[PDB]
Amino acid sequence: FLKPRLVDIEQVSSTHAKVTLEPLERGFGHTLGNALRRILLSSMPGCAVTEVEIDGVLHEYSTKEGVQEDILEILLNLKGLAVRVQGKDEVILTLNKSGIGPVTAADITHDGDVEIVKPQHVICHLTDENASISMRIKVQRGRGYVPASTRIHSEEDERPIGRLLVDACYSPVERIAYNVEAARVEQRTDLDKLVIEMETNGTIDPEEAIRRAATILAEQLEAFVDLE
C-alpha cells in the first residue's frame, strides 16, 4: 500500500487548474477522486457578499436616475463578484463612483485586507454625466450556498430599511473532473495516476483546496482513529 503524493501542479488560467497524484494502488483513482470531488463541490471556505446598501435605494425592485442597470440586476452582478480575505471574516467595502461609463469592479476603494481576482468585472453601467453611486458592500466567509430567505431567522435586529440582503454563495470551486491512467512507478508494473482537472473562481489556491479536502475527509474517520 504505497502512500500517494502530489506531483504535477500547473495552473493554466486564472480559474482553470490541474492537479495530479501518481502513486496509487490498482483501481484507487476512482475511490479517491470521486470522493475528493464530492468534498470540493460542497465544503470550501470561500467568500461572498451578504449585505448591500445602495444609498438612494430602499428595495431591490426599483430604478435609479442615471443608471441603466436595475437594482435587481446590480445585486445579481454583485453575487458574481470574486474576492478573497485572510485576516478577518466580516469586512465592509466602500464603492463610490460617478461619471459616465461602465463602472468596473476596480472602482472599490481598497481596504487593509482585501484583494480582487478579476477587476474587469462590471457592477453596473452609468449613462448620466452627474450620476453618482455610493454603496457599502458587506462581504464575509462561509461555506456552501446560503440563500437570503433562510438567513432572516437569527435576525440580529437589522435596523435601517435600506439594507438589501443578497443570496450568499460561498463556493470557491466551480467544476471538477478526474481521469486515471497507469504511469509506471520506478518499481511497479501498473499503478494508476489520477489527474484532477478543475475550474475555480480564482479565490482559493488549488493546493490548499486539495489539502483541506484531505482534512475534511480524514476528519470524518475520527470515530476510529488516534494518530498515525
Binding site: 470531488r37 464530492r38 460542497s42 467544476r175 471538477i176 473532473a177 478526474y178 475550474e199
Partner: peptide, 14 residues
Amino acid sequence: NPIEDMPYDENGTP
C-alpha cells in the same frame, strides 16, 4: 438534488 450527486460527463460538466 445536490450538485455532487448529479450525474456528469467526461468533461466534468454536470
